[PDB]
mmCIF file of all heavy atoms in Angstrom:
data_model
loop_
_atom_site.group_PDB
_atom_site.id
_atom_site.type_symbol
_atom_site.label_atom_id
_atom_site.label_comp_id
_atom_site.label_asym_id
_atom_site.label_seq_id
_atom_site.Cartn_x
_atom_site.Cartn_y
_atom_site.Cartn_z
ATOM 1 N N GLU A 1 0.846 -1.215 0.000
ATOM 2 C CA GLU A 1 0.000 0.000 0.000
ATOM 3 C C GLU A 1 0.869 1.249 0.000
ATOM 4 O O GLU A 1 0.565 2.224 -0.701
ATOM 5 C CB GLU A 1 -0.988 -0.028 1.162
ATOM 6 C CG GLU A 1 -2.085 -1.017 0.870
ATOM 7 C CD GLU A 1 -3.044 -1.169 2.013
ATOM 8 O OE1 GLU A 1 -2.999 -0.327 2.955
ATOM 9 O OE2 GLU A 1 -3.850 -2.134 1.940
ATOM 10 N N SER A 2 1.996 1.185 0.706
ATOM 11 C CA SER A 2 2.936 2.309 0.700
ATOM 12 C C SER A 2 3.558 2.531 -0.698
ATOM 13 O O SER A 2 3.564 3.667 -1.211
ATOM 14 C CB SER A 2 4.008 2.117 1.778
ATOM 15 O OG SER A 2 4.832 3.266 1.865
ATOM 16 N N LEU A 3 4.047 1.458 -1.333
ATOM 17 C CA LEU A 3 4.632 1.553 -2.663
ATOM 18 C C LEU A 3 3.597 2.112 -3.654
ATOM 19 O O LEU A 3 3.931 2.918 -4.525
ATOM 20 C CB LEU A 3 5.165 0.216 -3.133
ATOM 21 C CG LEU A 3 6.650 -0.049 -2.841
ATOM 22 C CD1 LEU A 3 6.984 0.067 -1.370
ATOM 23 C CD2 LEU A 3 7.017 -1.390 -3.363
ATOM 24 N N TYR A 4 2.341 1.689 -3.517
ATOM 25 C CA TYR A 4 1.297 2.109 -4.430
ATOM 26 C C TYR A 4 1.061 3.637 -4.421
ATOM 27 O O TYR A 4 0.667 4.216 -5.449
ATOM 28 C CB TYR A 4 0.041 1.377 -3.997
ATOM 29 C CG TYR A 4 -1.097 1.511 -4.956
ATOM 30 C CD1 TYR A 4 -1.127 0.758 -6.137
ATOM 31 C CD2 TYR A 4 -2.187 2.325 -4.638
ATOM 32 C CE1 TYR A 4 -2.211 0.837 -7.001
ATOM 33 C CE2 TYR A 4 -3.303 2.405 -5.502
ATOM 34 C CZ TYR A 4 -3.296 1.670 -6.663
ATOM 35 O OH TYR A 4 -4.374 1.759 -7.516
ATOM 36 N N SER A 5 1.337 4.275 -3.290
ATOM 37 C CA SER A 5 1.180 5.704 -3.155
ATOM 38 C C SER A 5 2.366 6.514 -3.730
ATOM 39 O O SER A 5 2.312 7.755 -3.752
ATOM 40 C CB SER A 5 1.009 6.084 -1.668
ATOM 41 O OG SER A 5 2.234 6.011 -0.959
ATOM 42 N N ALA A 6 3.473 5.840 -4.090
ATOM 43 C CA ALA A 6 4.693 6.564 -4.460
ATOM 44 C C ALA A 6 4.507 7.349 -5.756
ATOM 45 O O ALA A 6 3.880 6.861 -6.719
ATOM 46 C CB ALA A 6 5.812 5.558 -4.647
ATOM 47 N N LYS A 7 5.090 8.540 -5.780
ATOM 48 C CA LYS A 7 5.094 9.406 -6.980
ATOM 49 C C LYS A 7 6.482 9.599 -7.574
ATOM 50 O O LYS A 7 6.580 9.875 -8.767
ATOM 51 C CB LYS A 7 4.551 10.811 -6.624
ATOM 52 C CG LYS A 7 3.137 10.828 -6.045
ATOM 53 C CD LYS A 7 2.178 10.193 -6.977
ATOM 54 C CE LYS A 7 0.810 10.131 -6.290
ATOM 55 N NZ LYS A 7 0.033 8.930 -6.758
ATOM 56 N N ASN A 8 7.539 9.498 -6.750
ATOM 57 C CA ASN A 8 8.908 9.795 -7.221
ATOM 58 C C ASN A 8 9.828 8.597 -7.109
ATOM 59 O O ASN A 8 10.329 8.125 -8.132
ATOM 60 C CB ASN A 8 9.521 11.014 -6.489
ATOM 61 C CG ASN A 8 8.844 12.298 -6.920
ATOM 62 O OD1 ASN A 8 8.705 12.530 -8.122
ATOM 63 N ND2 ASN A 8 8.424 13.116 -5.953
ATOM 64 N N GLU A 9 10.004 8.073 -5.885
ATOM 65 C CA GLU A 9 10.951 6.976 -5.737
ATOM 66 C C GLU A 9 10.581 6.163 -4.509
ATOM 67 O O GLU A 9 10.100 6.707 -3.520
ATOM 68 C CB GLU A 9 12.377 7.563 -5.516
ATOM 69 C CG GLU A 9 13.478 6.523 -5.189
ATOM 70 C CD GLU A 9 14.843 7.137 -4.818
ATOM 71 O OE1 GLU A 9 14.952 8.364 -4.608
ATOM 72 O OE2 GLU A 9 15.838 6.361 -4.806
ATOM 73 N N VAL A 10 10.841 4.876 -4.600
ATOM 74 C CA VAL A 10 10.773 4.007 -3.433
ATOM 75 C C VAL A 10 12.146 3.382 -3.257
ATOM 76 O O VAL A 10 12.739 2.915 -4.234
ATOM 77 C CB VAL A 10 9.676 2.916 -3.547
ATOM 78 C CG1 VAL A 10 8.278 3.571 -3.620
ATOM 79 C CG2 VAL A 10 9.923 1.985 -4.716
ATOM 80 N N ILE A 11 12.621 3.378 -2.014
ATOM 81 C CA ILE A 11 13.855 2.660 -1.680
ATOM 82 C C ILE A 11 13.385 1.405 -0.985
ATOM 83 O O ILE A 11 12.577 1.475 -0.031
ATOM 84 C CB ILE A 11 14.775 3.446 -0.716
ATOM 85 C CG1 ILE A 11 15.164 4.778 -1.374
ATOM 86 C CG2 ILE A 11 15.988 2.573 -0.363
ATOM 87 C CD1 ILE A 11 16.117 5.590 -0.483
ATOM 88 N N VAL A 12 13.870 0.255 -1.457
ATOM 89 C CA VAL A 12 13.468 -1.030 -0.857
ATOM 90 C C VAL A 12 14.764 -1.731 -0.460
ATOM 91 O O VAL A 12 15.646 -1.891 -1.310
ATOM 92 C CB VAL A 12 12.650 -1.886 -1.871
ATOM 93 C CG1 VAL A 12 12.391 -3.306 -1.349
ATOM 94 C CG2 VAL A 12 11.351 -1.157 -2.224
ATOM 95 N N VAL A 13 14.844 -2.156 0.796
ATOM 96 C CA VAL A 13 15.963 -3.001 1.241
ATOM 97 C C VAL A 13 15.315 -4.332 1.600
ATOM 98 O O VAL A 13 14.415 -4.375 2.463
ATOM 99 C CB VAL A 13 16.698 -2.399 2.474
ATOM 100 C CG1 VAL A 13 17.926 -3.228 2.815
ATOM 101 C CG2 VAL A 13 17.087 -0.948 2.222
ATOM 102 N N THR A 14 15.725 -5.410 0.932
ATOM 103 C CA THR A 14 15.068 -6.690 1.189
ATOM 104 C C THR A 14 16.064 -7.840 1.269
ATOM 105 O O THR A 14 17.051 -7.875 0.515
ATOM 106 C CB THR A 14 13.996 -7.042 0.097
ATOM 107 O OG1 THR A 14 13.288 -8.247 0.469
ATOM 108 C CG2 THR A 14 14.653 -7.256 -1.272
ATOM 109 N N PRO A 15 15.824 -8.789 2.177
ATOM 110 C CA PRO A 15 16.542 -10.070 2.017
ATOM 111 C C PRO A 15 16.118 -10.687 0.713
ATOM 112 O O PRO A 15 14.950 -10.599 0.332
ATOM 113 C CB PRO A 15 16.003 -10.938 3.173
ATOM 114 C CG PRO A 15 15.443 -9.915 4.191
ATOM 115 C CD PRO A 15 14.911 -8.760 3.332
ATOM 116 N N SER A 16 17.025 -11.405 0.082
ATOM 117 C CA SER A 16 16.689 -12.032 -1.192
ATOM 118 C C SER A 16 15.579 -13.080 -1.077
ATOM 119 O O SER A 16 14.869 -13.342 -2.074
ATOM 120 C CB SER A 16 17.951 -12.607 -1.850
ATOM 121 O OG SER A 16 18.553 -13.585 -1.018
ATOM 122 N N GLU A 17 15.386 -13.627 0.128
ATOM 123 C CA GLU A 17 14.295 -14.562 0.426
ATOM 124 C C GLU A 17 12.944 -14.009 0.037
ATOM 125 O O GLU A 17 12.007 -14.768 -0.180
ATOM 126 C CB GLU A 17 14.273 -14.855 1.945
ATOM 127 C CG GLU A 17 15.413 -15.689 2.462
ATOM 128 C CD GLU A 17 16.622 -14.900 2.901
ATOM 129 O OE1 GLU A 17 16.994 -13.877 2.254
ATOM 130 O OE2 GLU A 17 17.246 -15.386 3.874
ATOM 131 N N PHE A 18 12.844 -12.692 0.050
ATOM 132 C CA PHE A 18 11.535 -12.062 -0.151
ATOM 133 C C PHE A 18 11.362 -11.357 -1.463
ATOM 134 O O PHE A 18 10.283 -10.757 -1.703
ATOM 135 C CB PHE A 18 11.177 -11.106 0.996
ATOM 136 C CG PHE A 18 11.195 -11.798 2.321
ATOM 137 C CD1 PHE A 18 12.256 -11.628 3.203
ATOM 138 C CD2 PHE A 18 10.235 -12.756 2.603
ATOM 139 C CE1 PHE A 18 12.293 -12.326 4.395
ATOM 140 C CE2 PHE A 18 10.263 -13.470 3.817
ATOM 141 C CZ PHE A 18 11.302 -13.229 4.713
ATOM 142 N N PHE A 19 12.368 -11.459 -2.334
ATOM 143 C CA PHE A 19 12.237 -10.815 -3.621
ATOM 144 C C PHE A 19 10.996 -11.312 -4.390
ATOM 145 O O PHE A 19 10.231 -10.493 -4.954
ATOM 146 C CB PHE A 19 13.495 -10.964 -4.447
ATOM 147 C CG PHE A 19 13.420 -10.206 -5.746
ATOM 148 C CD1 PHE A 19 13.555 -8.816 -5.762
ATOM 149 C CD2 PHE A 19 13.122 -10.853 -6.945
ATOM 150 C CE1 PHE A 19 13.496 -8.113 -6.938
ATOM 151 C CE2 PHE A 19 13.057 -10.112 -8.151
ATOM 152 C CZ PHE A 19 13.211 -8.753 -8.130
ATOM 153 N N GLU A 20 10.799 -12.636 -4.487
ATOM 154 C CA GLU A 20 9.635 -13.116 -5.246
ATOM 155 C C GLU A 20 8.294 -12.622 -4.683
ATOM 156 O O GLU A 20 7.320 -12.404 -5.442
ATOM 157 C CB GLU A 20 9.644 -14.642 -5.377
ATOM 158 C CG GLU A 20 10.769 -15.199 -6.278
ATOM 159 C CD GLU A 20 10.928 -14.435 -7.605
ATOM 160 O OE1 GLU A 20 9.892 -14.261 -8.288
ATOM 161 O OE2 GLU A 20 12.071 -14.025 -7.969
ATOM 162 N N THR A 21 8.215 -12.433 -3.370
ATOM 163 C CA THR A 21 7.027 -11.867 -2.732
ATOM 164 C C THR A 21 6.698 -10.470 -3.248
ATOM 165 O O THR A 21 5.519 -10.130 -3.436
ATOM 166 C CB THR A 21 7.177 -11.878 -1.190
ATOM 167 O OG1 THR A 21 7.376 -13.231 -0.765
ATOM 168 C CG2 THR A 21 5.942 -11.353 -0.453
ATOM 169 N N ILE A 22 7.730 -9.679 -3.514
ATOM 170 C CA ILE A 22 7.505 -8.285 -3.903
ATOM 171 C C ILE A 22 7.797 -7.951 -5.357
ATOM 172 O O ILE A 22 7.572 -6.799 -5.768
ATOM 173 C CB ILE A 22 8.294 -7.334 -2.954
ATOM 174 C CG1 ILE A 22 9.821 -7.469 -3.130
ATOM 175 C CG2 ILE A 22 7.798 -7.500 -1.479
ATOM 176 C CD1 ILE A 22 10.631 -6.374 -2.428
ATOM 177 N N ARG A 23 8.221 -8.949 -6.136
ATOM 178 C CA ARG A 23 8.654 -8.727 -7.494
ATOM 179 C C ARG A 23 7.604 -7.963 -8.325
ATOM 180 O O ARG A 23 7.906 -6.939 -8.941
ATOM 181 C CB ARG A 23 8.945 -10.081 -8.162
ATOM 182 C CG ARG A 23 9.064 -10.032 -9.712
ATOM 183 C CD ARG A 23 9.117 -11.446 -10.330
ATOM 184 N NE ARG A 23 10.392 -12.127 -10.111
ATOM 185 C CZ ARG A 23 11.481 -12.027 -10.873
ATOM 186 N NH1 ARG A 23 11.508 -11.197 -11.917
ATOM 187 N NH2 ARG A 23 12.571 -12.733 -10.562
ATOM 188 N N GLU A 24 6.363 -8.433 -8.308
ATOM 189 C CA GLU A 24 5.350 -7.779 -9.128
ATOM 190 C C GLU A 24 4.989 -6.391 -8.624
ATOM 191 O O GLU A 24 4.596 -5.532 -9.428
ATOM 192 C CB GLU A 24 4.114 -8.676 -9.241
ATOM 193 C CG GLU A 24 4.388 -9.921 -10.084
ATOM 194 C CD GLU A 24 4.975 -9.597 -11.473
ATOM 195 O OE1 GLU A 24 4.573 -8.585 -12.102
ATOM 196 O OE2 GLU A 24 5.857 -10.335 -11.937
ATOM 197 N N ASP A 25 5.115 -6.159 -7.311
ATOM 198 C CA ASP A 25 4.892 -4.815 -6.784
ATOM 199 C C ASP A 25 5.971 -3.809 -7.142
ATOM 200 O O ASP A 25 5.654 -2.670 -7.496
ATOM 201 C CB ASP A 25 4.866 -4.844 -5.233
ATOM 202 C CG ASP A 25 3.867 -5.829 -4.696
ATOM 203 O OD1 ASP A 25 2.669 -5.661 -5.009
ATOM 204 O OD2 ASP A 25 4.282 -6.782 -3.999
ATOM 205 N N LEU A 26 7.215 -4.250 -7.241
ATOM 206 C CA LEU A 26 8.214 -3.565 -8.036
ATOM 207 C C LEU A 26 7.934 -3.234 -9.447
ATOM 208 O O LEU A 26 8.148 -2.088 -9.890
ATOM 209 C CB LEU A 26 9.619 -4.197 -7.824
ATOM 210 C CG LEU A 26 10.064 -4.510 -6.384
ATOM 211 C CD1 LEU A 26 11.526 -4.989 -6.402
ATOM 212 C CD2 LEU A 26 9.838 -3.318 -5.402
ATOM 213 N N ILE A 27 7.532 -4.250 -10.179
ATOM 214 C CA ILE A 27 7.202 -4.029 -11.569
ATOM 215 C C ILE A 27 6.113 -2.966 -11.731
ATOM 216 O O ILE A 27 6.257 -2.080 -12.580
ATOM 217 C CB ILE A 27 6.764 -5.336 -12.198
ATOM 218 C CG1 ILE A 27 7.952 -6.301 -12.245
ATOM 219 C CG2 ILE A 27 6.146 -5.086 -13.598
ATOM 220 C CD1 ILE A 27 8.911 -6.064 -13.356
ATOM 221 N N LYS A 28 5.053 -3.053 -10.922
ATOM 222 C CA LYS A 28 3.923 -2.128 -11.058
ATOM 223 C C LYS A 28 4.307 -0.712 -10.670
ATOM 224 O O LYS A 28 3.857 0.261 -11.304
ATOM 225 C CB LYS A 28 2.701 -2.604 -10.293
ATOM 226 C CG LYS A 28 2.136 -3.905 -10.889
ATOM 227 C CD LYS A 28 0.914 -4.407 -10.131
ATOM 228 C CE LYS A 28 1.208 -4.674 -8.643
ATOM 229 N NZ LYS A 28 0.168 -5.533 -7.990
ATOM 230 N N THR A 29 5.202 -0.594 -9.696
ATOM 231 C CA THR A 29 5.726 0.708 -9.318
ATOM 232 C C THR A 29 6.522 1.349 -10.469
ATOM 233 O O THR A 29 6.306 2.518 -10.836
ATOM 234 C CB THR A 29 6.616 0.576 -8.059
ATOM 235 O OG1 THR A 29 5.819 -0.017 -7.027
ATOM 236 C CG2 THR A 29 7.088 1.930 -7.583
ATOM 237 N N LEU A 30 7.436 0.579 -11.048
ATOM 238 C CA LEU A 30 8.225 1.053 -12.202
ATOM 239 C C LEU A 30 7.329 1.482 -13.356
ATOM 240 O O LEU A 30 7.638 2.464 -14.056
ATOM 241 C CB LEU A 30 9.147 -0.074 -12.695
ATOM 242 C CG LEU A 30 10.336 -0.359 -11.765
ATOM 243 C CD1 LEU A 30 11.002 -1.685 -12.121
ATOM 244 C CD2 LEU A 30 11.367 0.793 -11.764
ATOM 245 N N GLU A 31 6.255 0.722 -13.563
ATOM 246 C CA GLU A 31 5.366 1.013 -14.714
ATOM 247 C C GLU A 31 4.612 2.360 -14.580
ATOM 248 O O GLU A 31 4.124 2.915 -15.584
ATOM 249 C CB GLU A 31 4.406 -0.156 -14.946
ATOM 250 C CG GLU A 31 5.080 -1.408 -15.519
ATOM 251 C CD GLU A 31 4.189 -2.679 -15.533
ATOM 252 O OE1 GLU A 31 3.214 -2.787 -14.745
ATOM 253 O OE2 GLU A 31 4.508 -3.577 -16.335
ATOM 254 N N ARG A 32 4.519 2.903 -13.361
ATOM 255 C CA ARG A 32 3.952 4.245 -13.167
ATOM 256 C C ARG A 32 5.000 5.351 -13.402
ATOM 257 O O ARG A 32 4.669 6.533 -13.286
ATOM 258 C CB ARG A 32 3.380 4.423 -11.765
ATOM 259 C CG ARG A 32 2.223 3.503 -11.415
ATOM 260 C CD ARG A 32 1.397 4.040 -10.250
ATOM 261 N NE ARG A 32 2.230 4.384 -9.101
ATOM 262 C CZ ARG A 32 2.627 3.499 -8.200
ATOM 263 N NH1 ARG A 32 2.206 2.218 -8.306
ATOM 264 N NH2 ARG A 32 3.419 3.891 -7.184
ATOM 265 N N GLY A 33 6.253 4.976 -13.689
ATOM 266 C CA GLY A 33 7.308 5.992 -13.885
ATOM 267 C C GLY A 33 8.072 6.346 -12.599
ATOM 268 O O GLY A 33 8.942 7.236 -12.607
ATOM 269 N N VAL A 34 7.758 5.639 -11.512
ATOM 270 C CA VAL A 34 8.425 5.842 -10.219
ATOM 271 C C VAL A 34 9.736 5.067 -10.205
ATOM 272 O O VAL A 34 9.823 3.917 -10.706
ATOM 273 C CB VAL A 34 7.493 5.322 -9.126
ATOM 274 C CG1 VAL A 34 8.127 5.351 -7.744
ATOM 275 C CG2 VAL A 34 6.191 6.117 -9.122
ATOM 276 N N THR A 35 10.778 5.709 -9.681
ATOM 277 C CA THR A 35 12.063 4.993 -9.556
ATOM 278 C C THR A 35 12.010 3.946 -8.455
ATOM 279 O O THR A 35 11.475 4.238 -7.366
ATOM 280 C CB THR A 35 13.207 5.996 -9.256
ATOM 281 O OG1 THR A 35 13.363 6.835 -10.408
ATOM 282 C CG2 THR A 35 14.543 5.338 -8.932
ATOM 283 N N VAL A 36 12.560 2.762 -8.727
ATOM 284 C CA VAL A 36 12.749 1.798 -7.653
ATOM 285 C C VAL A 36 14.249 1.682 -7.423
ATOM 286 O O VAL A 36 14.984 1.309 -8.360
ATOM 287 C CB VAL A 36 12.137 0.401 -7.951
ATOM 288 C CG1 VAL A 36 12.520 -0.636 -6.874
ATOM 289 C CG2 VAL A 36 10.608 0.519 -8.076
ATOM 290 N N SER A 37 14.676 1.931 -6.169
ATOM 291 C CA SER A 37 16.068 1.787 -5.764
ATOM 292 C C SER A 37 16.115 0.633 -4.778
ATOM 293 O O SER A 37 15.738 0.798 -3.609
ATOM 294 C CB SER A 37 16.591 3.097 -5.143
ATOM 295 O OG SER A 37 16.541 4.150 -6.114
ATOM 296 N N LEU A 38 16.581 -0.525 -5.276
ATOM 297 C CA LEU A 38 16.550 -1.767 -4.511
ATOM 298 C C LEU A 38 17.939 -2.081 -3.939
ATOM 299 O O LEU A 38 18.946 -1.977 -4.659
ATOM 300 C CB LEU A 38 16.150 -2.887 -5.499
ATOM 301 C CG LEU A 38 16.125 -4.321 -4.961
ATOM 302 C CD1 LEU A 38 15.061 -4.521 -3.883
ATOM 303 C CD2 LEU A 38 15.868 -5.319 -6.076
ATOM 304 N N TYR A 39 17.926 -2.543 -2.692
ATOM 305 C CA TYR A 39 19.118 -3.118 -2.045
ATOM 306 C C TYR A 39 18.804 -4.564 -1.709
ATOM 307 O O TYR A 39 17.738 -4.848 -1.152
ATOM 308 C CB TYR A 39 19.451 -2.377 -0.732
ATOM 309 C CG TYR A 39 19.961 -0.963 -0.957
ATOM 310 C CD1 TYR A 39 19.085 0.103 -1.135
ATOM 311 C CD2 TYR A 39 21.344 -0.716 -0.998
ATOM 312 C CE1 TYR A 39 19.554 1.385 -1.330
ATOM 313 C CE2 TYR A 39 21.856 0.559 -1.181
ATOM 314 C CZ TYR A 39 20.948 1.618 -1.374
ATOM 315 O OH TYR A 39 21.418 2.882 -1.600
ATOM 316 N N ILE A 40 19.712 -5.474 -2.070
ATOM 317 C CA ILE A 40 19.430 -6.901 -1.910
ATOM 318 C C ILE A 40 20.767 -7.665 -1.762
ATOM 319 O O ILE A 40 21.777 -7.208 -2.281
ATOM 320 C CB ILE A 40 18.582 -7.411 -3.110
ATOM 321 C CG1 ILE A 40 18.020 -8.813 -2.867
ATOM 322 C CG2 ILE A 40 19.380 -7.334 -4.454
ATOM 323 C CD1 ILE A 40 16.855 -9.170 -3.844
ATOM 324 N N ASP A 41 20.746 -8.805 -1.032
ATOM 325 C CA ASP A 41 22.005 -9.497 -0.773
ATOM 326 C C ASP A 41 22.518 -10.342 -1.957
ATOM 327 O O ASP A 41 23.697 -10.708 -1.962
ATOM 328 C CB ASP A 41 21.884 -10.390 0.473
ATOM 329 C CG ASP A 41 20.664 -11.256 0.405
ATOM 330 O OD1 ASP A 41 19.586 -10.754 0.762
ATOM 331 O OD2 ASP A 41 20.752 -12.421 -0.046
ATOM 332 N N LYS A 42 21.634 -10.657 -2.912
ATOM 333 C CA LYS A 42 21.996 -11.433 -4.088
ATOM 334 C C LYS A 42 21.132 -10.908 -5.217
ATOM 335 O O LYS A 42 19.912 -10.736 -5.033
ATOM 336 C CB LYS A 42 21.670 -12.905 -3.838
ATOM 337 C CG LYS A 42 22.045 -13.791 -5.021
ATOM 338 C CD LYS A 42 21.972 -15.284 -4.662
ATOM 339 C CE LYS A 42 20.524 -15.729 -4.385
ATOM 340 N NZ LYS A 42 19.608 -15.635 -5.573
ATOM 341 N N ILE A 43 21.735 -10.653 -6.384
ATOM 342 C CA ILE A 43 20.959 -10.093 -7.499
ATOM 343 C C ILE A 43 20.124 -11.196 -8.150
ATOM 344 O O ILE A 43 20.681 -12.220 -8.555
ATOM 345 C CB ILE A 43 21.883 -9.469 -8.573
ATOM 346 C CG1 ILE A 43 22.898 -8.500 -7.966
ATOM 347 C CG2 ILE A 43 21.020 -8.767 -9.648
ATOM 348 C CD1 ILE A 43 22.265 -7.400 -7.159
ATOM 349 N N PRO A 44 18.796 -11.011 -8.214
ATOM 350 C CA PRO A 44 17.925 -12.030 -8.810
ATOM 351 C C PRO A 44 17.996 -12.006 -10.340
ATOM 352 O O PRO A 44 18.722 -11.174 -10.918
ATOM 353 C CB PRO A 44 16.508 -11.620 -8.379
ATOM 354 C CG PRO A 44 16.625 -10.352 -7.604
ATOM 355 C CD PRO A 44 18.047 -9.842 -7.734
ATOM 356 N N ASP A 45 17.237 -12.927 -10.951
ATOM 357 C CA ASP A 45 16.917 -12.866 -12.383
ATOM 358 C C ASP A 45 16.059 -11.618 -12.576
ATOM 359 O O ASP A 45 14.917 -11.576 -12.082
ATOM 360 C CB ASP A 45 16.123 -14.111 -12.822
ATOM 361 C CG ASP A 45 15.906 -14.166 -14.340
ATOM 362 O OD1 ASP A 45 15.899 -13.096 -14.997
ATOM 363 O OD2 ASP A 45 15.741 -15.287 -14.884
ATOM 364 N N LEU A 46 16.621 -10.622 -13.280
ATOM 365 C CA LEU A 46 15.915 -9.370 -13.558
ATOM 366 C C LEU A 46 15.478 -9.192 -15.028
ATOM 367 O O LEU A 46 15.234 -8.056 -15.463
ATOM 368 C CB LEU A 46 16.759 -8.175 -13.098
ATOM 369 C CG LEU A 46 17.095 -8.144 -11.591
ATOM 370 C CD1 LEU A 46 18.131 -7.068 -11.260
ATOM 371 C CD2 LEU A 46 15.852 -8.006 -10.739
#
């Protein structure tokens, strides 16, 4: 719900365990033109 309200940028710090949980919410945020700045311990398939 917080990401959905973003207009400029969201910073997300996540354990890699949870990337799949939030992957589509990332995608939808990017699709509105909002920057996603992700921090993660292992880079997923992007």
